Amino acid sequence: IXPEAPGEDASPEELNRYYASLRHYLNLVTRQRY
Numbered sequence: 842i843x844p845e846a847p848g849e850d851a852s853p854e855e856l857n858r859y860y861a862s863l864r865h866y867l868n869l870v871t872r873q874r875y
């Protein structure tokens with residue numbers, strides 16, 4: 842897979858965005874939970 846990737850605002854705030862896309866993209870395909 843490869844999700845929605847940031848780089849426009851601020852580093853830790855955009856880490857949170859990509860980590861949210863990561864958990865979404867996992868829930869989209871495989872049965873693991875957060």
Ligand code: CNC
Pocket residue numbers: 846847848849851852855856859
């Ligand atoms: C391709 O392999 C992708 O990897 C590129 N990338 C991301 N981070 C990198 C760090 C370094 C030193 C180098 C040489 C490359 C790095 C880039 O993201 C490539 O992705 P693409 O899809 O091709 O480009 C997308 C479309 C746009 N990307 C951006 O604009 C960058 C966004 C980012 C918020 C970001 C991301 C998303 C990712 N990092 Co980087 C972090 N954290 N970073 C590492 C790893 C990633 C990770 C792979 C998880 C994300 C990539 C996902 C993606 N496709 O976008 C680690 C390096 C691993 C390695 N291969 O050597 C790390 C060195 C260690 C760590 N885990 O913290 C790392 C650091 C320290 C830093 N990342 C920066 C650049 C952010 C960036 C935000 C920004 N402001 O631009 N990463 C950041 C500034 C964040 C920070 N912690 O401060 C760090 C650089 C050091 C510094 N100057 O402070």
